[PDB]
Design an enzyme around this catalytic site. Sequence first.
Site, PDB file in Angstrom:
ATOM      1  N   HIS A 159      -9.034   6.594   4.969  1.00 28.68           N
ATOM      2  CA  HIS A 159      -7.607   6.520   5.335  1.00 28.68           C
ATOM      3  C   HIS A 159      -6.940   7.882   5.369  1.00 28.68           C
ATOM      4  O   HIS A 159      -5.769   7.960   5.652  1.00 28.68           O
ATOM      5  CB  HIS A 159      -6.820   5.601   4.403  1.00 28.68           C
ATOM      6  CG  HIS A 159      -6.835   6.038   2.978  1.00 28.68           C
ATOM      7  ND1 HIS A 159      -7.723   5.523   2.050  1.00 28.68           N
ATOM      8  CD2 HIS A 159      -6.082   6.943   2.312  1.00 28.68           C
ATOM      9  CE1 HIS A 159      -7.508   6.087   0.871  1.00 28.68           C
ATOM     10  NE2 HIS A 159      -6.516   6.950   1.002  1.00 28.68           N
ATOM     11  N   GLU A 182     -14.744   2.836   3.111  1.00 26.04           N
ATOM     12  CA  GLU A 182     -13.627   3.672   2.743  1.00 26.04           C
ATOM     13  C   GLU A 182     -14.027   5.147   2.563  1.00 26.04           C
ATOM     14  O   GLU A 182     -13.440   5.906   1.804  1.00 26.04           O
ATOM     15  CB  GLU A 182     -12.962   3.111   1.486  1.00 26.04           C
ATOM     16  CG  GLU A 182     -11.543   3.581   1.320  1.00 26.04           C
ATOM     17  CD  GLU A 182     -10.772   3.459   2.625  1.00 26.04           C
ATOM     18  OE1 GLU A 182     -11.178   2.660   3.516  1.00 26.04           O
ATOM     19  OE2 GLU A 182      -9.735   4.154   2.753  1.00 26.04           O
ATOM     20  N   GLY A 186      -1.255  10.507  -4.235  1.00 22.75           N
ATOM     21  CA  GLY A 186      -1.595  11.921  -4.210  1.00 22.75           C
ATOM     22  C   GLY A 186      -2.895  12.254  -4.914  1.00 22.75           C
ATOM     23  O   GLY A 186      -3.320  13.417  -4.919  1.00 22.75           O
ATOM     24  N   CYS A 210      -5.787  10.426  -4.206  1.00 24.71           N
ATOM     25  CA  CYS A 210      -6.931   9.918  -3.465  1.00 24.71           C
ATOM     26  C   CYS A 210      -7.864  11.061  -3.142  1.00 24.71           C
ATOM     27  O   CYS A 210      -7.440  12.189  -2.954  1.00 24.71           O
ATOM     28  CB  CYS A 210      -6.568   9.208  -2.162  1.00 24.71           C
ATOM     29  SG  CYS A 210      -5.986   7.550  -2.450  1.00 24.71           S
TER      30      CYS A 210
HETATM   31  C1  LIG Z   1      -4.336   7.849  -2.902  1.00 25.36           C
HETATM   32  C2  LIG Z   1      -4.010   8.382  -1.568  1.00 25.36           C
HETATM   33  C3  LIG Z   1      -2.570   8.544  -1.298  1.00 25.36           C
HETATM   34  O1  LIG Z   1      -1.934   9.538  -1.543  1.00 25.36           O
HETATM   35  O2  LIG Z   1      -1.938   7.468  -0.642  1.00 25.36           O
HETATM   36  C4  LIG Z   1      -1.497   7.648   0.736  1.00 25.36           C
HETATM   37  C5  LIG Z   1      -0.921   9.041   1.036  1.00 25.36           C
HETATM   38  C6  LIG Z   1      -3.558   6.610  -3.231  1.00 25.36           C
HETATM   39  C7  LIG Z   1      -3.757   6.321  -4.710  1.00 25.36           C
HETATM   40  C8  LIG Z   1      -3.320   4.925  -5.093  1.00 25.36           C
HETATM   41  C9  LIG Z   1      -1.979   4.565  -4.464  1.00 25.36           C
HETATM   42  C10 LIG Z   1      -1.032   4.311  -5.641  1.00 25.36           C
HETATM   43  N1  LIG Z   1      -1.874   4.461  -6.827  1.00 25.36           N
HETATM   44  C11 LIG Z   1      -3.108   4.842  -6.580  1.00 25.36           C
HETATM   45  O3  LIG Z   1      -3.967   5.120  -7.403  1.00 25.36           O
HETATM   46  N2  LIG Z   1      -4.142   5.468  -2.551  1.00 25.36           N
HETATM   47  C12 LIG Z   1      -3.474   4.782  -1.737  1.00 25.36           C
HETATM   48  O4  LIG Z   1      -2.319   5.008  -1.433  1.00 25.36           O
HETATM   49  C13 LIG Z   1      -4.158   3.616  -1.155  1.00 25.36           C
HETATM   50  C14 LIG Z   1      -3.513   3.218   0.163  1.00 25.36           C
HETATM   51  C15 LIG Z   1      -4.504   2.802   1.212  1.00 25.36           C
HETATM   52  C16 LIG Z   1      -4.063   2.602   2.531  1.00 25.36           C
HETATM   53  C17 LIG Z   1      -4.905   2.204   3.579  1.00 25.36           C
HETATM   54  C18 LIG Z   1      -6.230   2.004   3.301  1.00 25.36           C
HETATM   55  C19 LIG Z   1      -6.631   2.218   2.002  1.00 25.36           C
HETATM   56  C20 LIG Z   1      -5.818   2.584   0.943  1.00 25.36           C
HETATM   57  N3  LIG Z   1      -3.955   2.547  -2.115  1.00 25.36           N
HETATM   58  C21 LIG Z   1      -4.152   1.308  -1.969  1.00 25.36           C
HETATM   59  O5  LIG Z   1      -4.533   0.822  -0.918  1.00 25.36           O
HETATM   60  C22 LIG Z   1      -3.827   0.564  -3.226  1.00 25.36           C
HETATM   61  C23 LIG Z   1      -3.396  -0.824  -2.902  1.00 25.36           C
HETATM   62  C24 LIG Z   1      -4.343  -1.883  -3.418  1.00 25.36           C
HETATM   63  C25 LIG Z   1      -5.081  -1.650  -4.728  1.00 25.36           C
HETATM   64  C26 LIG Z   1      -5.819  -1.545  -3.384  1.00 25.36           C
END
Ligand SMILES: */C(=C/C(=O)OCC)[C@H](C[C@@H]1CCNC1=O)NC(=O)[C@H](Cc1ccccc1)NC(=O)CCC1CC1
Length: 178
Positions: free
Chosen positions: A38, A69, A143, A145
């Site tokens: 993503h 992923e 932030g 990921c």
């Molecule tokens: C890491 C990347 C980030 O900065 O997000 C987008 C800029 C985050 C870390 C997660 C989110 C909040 N807490 C965390 O530990 N990951 C995500 O945002 C990710 C969004 C996403 C979108 C599309 C495809 C995959 C992932 N988080 C999720 O999807 C979390 C939601 C449910 C638990 C799976």
Amino acid sequence: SLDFALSLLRRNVRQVQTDQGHFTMLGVRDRLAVLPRHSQPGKTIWIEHKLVNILDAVELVDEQGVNLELTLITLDTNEKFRDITKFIPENISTASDATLVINTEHMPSMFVPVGDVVQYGFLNLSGKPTHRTMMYNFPTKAGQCGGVVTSVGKVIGIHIGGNGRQGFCAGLKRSYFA
Ligand SMILES: */C(=C/C(=O)OCC)[C@H](C[C@@H]1CCNC1=O)NC(=O)[C@H](Cc1ccccc1)NC(=O)CCC1CC1
């Protein structure tokens, strides 16, 4: 062990930016790095303040065609990553007392004690079905990921999501990097 994470952080984990935001990238070997899918690294990517061209990207899916992923990208540079393929196991592994190594421009050189990493398998990641995931009971945040889940000189996974109370990573296995 702590030490490993530091050698990793120092020679293999880099701060990047795509059109989607800030991520931690893991350099595995040569010009091969791995990112969350993503993160959407297009034909270019920003690696620590400089634009770098991506020569090839591959979004990993499993046998059934289900998202994993993870995206493999080949960078256009004269720098080579230290080969850490030997630190990645052949089979997706659990772990105790893991540490999540983050290196973003907003969160540089950050170690987070996620604790125990267990098998989870399927996960619904924001509408996208995902396999081979692992879970830790730690409230990971945005932030973070791309962070590298590590334990006892092993690189086991790449953080991809969390629900406020738990975190999920995409498991890493050596066969992915051949
Ligand atoms: C890491 C990347 C980030 O900065 O997000 C987008 C800029 C985050 C870390 C997660 C989110 C909040 N807490 C965390 O530990 N990951 C995500 O945002 C990710 C969004 C996403 C979108 C599309 C495809 C995959 C992932 N988080 C999720 O999807 C979390 C939601 C449910 C638990 C799976």
